[PDB]
Assembly symmetry: C2
Homo-oligomer: 177 residues x 2
């Protein structure tokens, strides 16, 4: 379009030092929503959108976990985890495991339906689009986060289920097609 | 019903990887021979320092460029840019990809930024990590620009999808 340049909507220049502004550009890339879980005497879960498939052979995925998260230390202590890719109607689960809202000290899994993952020993979220059980193969430096590279040990999927969406800091849904 | 997946079966594993929806970006580099590659393996990593990562296949032409150049750019594609997405998905290493699409030079990266994007990020390569049949490129964001009015393109189950209007 001839005028697209001068007609373009407001462009925001983003200073990467400006944490608020930077969060906004990071939020511009749409993603699904996962719950990463780990086992142990007190299992834990964390809603995460940083999940990324990495390699087919070998089968690898990654997740980025904040050093400020309880999950960070749980993962370094126990090098196996599960990923539950949430379905569109699972906002209850998404909220439950987000924003460090249910801290350690009491059971974090008493309000969400889950099944034990045999290979990971971690709770898997019932009703999810897919479950992946992974073994942590590498830890990579990621600034205020750590990049955990996982090797996929087993996985299950429900083809009739469609994933939740997250973008611009909000839950979204697909249009049919 | 539940479909069991054997991660050693490439076809079945692709299906499960496809179950996590993502956006779509074009990663670009400048230099002598500018290059672009459509990628959805992009994720944000860190706020301070500001870091992002992309995974690039070891056999991709872009893998050679990124390994050699200090900087790169990421354009997050807007909902109506399926054409651009397809365009950088073919070209021999000697055929210009940019002569038929709209772009602007990013001053910091030296790399073409795709016009009409939801966002532009210009990055400096920070680390390379092993990722099986891919390499993980970790970049530090030097500058970025966003157009809040614009909505990202979606990719899921192996096809392009769109947002339902926000209720």
């Amino acid at each position: 379009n001839a005028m697209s340049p001068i007609i373009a909507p407001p462009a925001e220049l983003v200073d990467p030092k400006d944490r608020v502004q930077l969060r906004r550009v990071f939020g511009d890339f749409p993603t699904g929503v996962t719950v990463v879980t780990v086992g142990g005497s007190e299992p834990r879960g964390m809603t995460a959108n940083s999940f990324t498939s990495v390699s087919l052979s070998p089968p690898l995925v990654l997740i980025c976990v904040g050093k400020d998260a309880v999950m960070h230390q749980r993962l370094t202590a126990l090098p196996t985890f599960a990923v539950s890719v949430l379905e569109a109607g699972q906002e209850k689960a998404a909220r439950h495991f987000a924003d460090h809202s249910h801290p350690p000290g009491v059971d974090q899994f008493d309000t969400v339906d889950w099944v034990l993952g045999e290979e990971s020993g971690a709770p898997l979220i019932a009703g999810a689009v897919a479950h992946l059980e992974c073994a942590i193969h590498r830890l990579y430096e990621g600034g205020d986060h750590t990049i955990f590279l996982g090797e996929v040990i087993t996985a299950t999927r429900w083809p009739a289920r469609e994933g939740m969406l997250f973008s611009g800091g909000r839950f979204r849904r697909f249009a049919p097609d």
